[PDB]
């Protein structure tokens, strides 16, 4: 129910948290500023935070034209990050061996959601009793995150953490079903939504409300230089605030 | 701009405060609908939200039929006087045959056009003649881009004192999904965008309800029971403390 | 065991022969009736394949109040009656309001429920009052197995002439998909089964699903329009498919 | 329109449909000789190009313990008793990277998953072994989208690509199949083949028939001996298919 990362505590009872940073490590100058931007503002309003960030962008298009820095040199600008601002980190990985070393840095290692069904990955993860975040395929229903959960318990690691992405909607579009954020938290597990990965910033910020309406533990963004993050995060505070102290 | 509709001393629109249309699916009884409607006005005079009450006079789209339908025009818009004249306050009914169109907007300040009924030409005409409130049900199988169509046909048959209604969308079979985003699509033809919560589908009624006024929502749509109707308190105080919330934005 | 529906001189039953419902959209005049009709009558007489004129006396649906609607009942009933004096074929047109039903089913041999108007209860049973054949429209957000309750009303109501019609089921947005799976479900039911090839859209394309649509073992199909090539491959494949035993 | 050639096997949107059939998983050396052996049987006295289907690993499940299959290595023993004993060629799914190669060796025909059809690295992994690429499409993909994941095989080296129908996603745990996407997907002129198996009773018959008048290269089966379609039935059924195949065929 509640998942201790250094000292930040994530549970859907709790205030949410912030899952934030970028798409993927571009360059180490760039990891540092977005990072130093989301911790002064999140620092400010006194929300819980953690960096985000891909080292790997499996999904692309050409042999080798940027997935981004590698898993060496990814997993030293986390270090770098983990030095300056204290702050826990999260970035997923794709091939069962890398979640050992990664599992060392990394506070938080993700599953990706087409990935997420692998059982060898799943297990490779799981072994590192590092915090697992599931993401939610876009083709599976919210019954379906059970039996993922599972192998994860199997494997003994039962820190978890379920991060919605919406779901299949006909072609090429994306519906995010509220319903499912209840149905999965009968599973007693921290739930996420992933606000930029689920579809102009007014879609965002709706979405993000919306989202935060059905009291959650925490949040995704991939934002970059935004620098209009404190009038966002604060109205979400604020709301997360009313919808957390209700019966 | 933003637009805003008036009715009986009602302000009704996506900037203001949310506005109930709640009520019973359908009336069953003349005193069953009393009833429900001092509960409702109960609260709702309690929590300071403009409460329209909210009944239908015919169930036609059945299931079967030899089924309850209800108490039919003439004896249904009775209970509506009754109601009207007792607590003081506007009804709103679906009417489904184009000559019922006009009777109906005598007595309801509000009519409502049925989801499946929303595409055809001679009752959206027959609702327009009546100078009266007009609240456009979405289908689940239409896109809240296609609601603009909808909005043309009426305010060129000469009303342009609309509301449109999200009550799901098609989501494989026998299964709806709300789309949060429709809200924001619909918003931008201005009008007045509510939200049916009921007929989107207990305690999942909460959560949608809650999802759904973060959107900043001109009102919610709403059906209660003695057989639920009494845990309505509880539930509204929570929609308007965040409805508060969610208005007060910049 | 499965019905056959009996309308004139014709048979049509999921095991006997396709039957073409051809013809237009809207009846636009009466000497444009008469011409599409000839070009039906001699190109399904020419193959074997049992024809019925279809069109409607009424478009209800036409986006703007003042866009052509069609000749309305009377005028649009004096056509009908000159198209089965001349062309002795019968005829398919569908009915929006109770009170058509009767005028419309004293010269139309079949009669069509619209889909949304669908499960309106007054009109379903006005139109099985007239002992005319009703053509069930299924709604493209009605699951296959939903047709029973149409069916039922009609039954009740003193009809059992039915005939349900697929038209594609709601996919996303705007999009329409055909599940070819549908028509072994309504098939079940035992009333005729047909499909609705044009309004299947929104090419080639319409003659694929066609195609397809045949493969599945069907009453006939809905068509408005070489239309000799169309359905002479049709004709071929109806053939062998229906000649096919059981597996 | 391409055609795809393997051993004397001719595979095409325009020619004669090739089975590509099998079973789900090699649940041991005996069951998939006997699977194998049935599927040759009857695609000789039918006379259709056949090629053996079957999965060395079943990568996901449900839960960790017990049955995934045979293994890489082992499982390649089956394989090469298979092509030995019976001169048919085989397909497979490859998982990892690492196995595009080690597997091209042994099997004629790979299978990039439907889920792993995205990530790049075992996309350009499968590319190089330059044997048959059968792409899976997801079902959550459309069909427009499967020239994005051709590019990326083309431009790395191999243009032997064959497209695959699963069906697409439907609301929650359930799925349709599109008949329009065939037409879609022919129009990058790679064939296109239809996995009725996968695309949900006697309802597979149904698809087959249905998939098979749209004019495909092809299409996948599974049966079994004893489930837990079956093994014995396959000639009046694959009959059936054959004479729609001929007659679809046909047409001008």
Redesign the interface.
Known sequence: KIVRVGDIQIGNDLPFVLFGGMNVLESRDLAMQVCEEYVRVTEKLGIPYVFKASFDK??????HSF?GPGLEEGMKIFEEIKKTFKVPVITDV??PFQAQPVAEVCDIIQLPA??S????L??AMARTNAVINIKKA??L?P??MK?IL??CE??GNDRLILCERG???????L?????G??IMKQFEYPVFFDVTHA?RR??VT??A??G???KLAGLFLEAHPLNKLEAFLS?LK??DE??KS?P
Do not use: P, W
């Not at 499996?58 to 042999?63: E, L, Q, T």
């Not at 069904?117 to 060898?120: A, E, G, I, P, S």
């Not at 519906?175 to 319903?179: C, G, I, P």
């Open positions: 499996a999904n692309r298009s050409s042999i997935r794709h091939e087409f990935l069904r692998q059982t060898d799943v297990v876009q083709f229903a019954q379906e039996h599972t192998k199997e494997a779901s299949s909607f006909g072609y090429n579009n519906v995010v079903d509220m319903l954020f209840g579809l007014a879609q709706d979405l409300k919306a935060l309406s059905q109205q604020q709301l009313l919808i209700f």
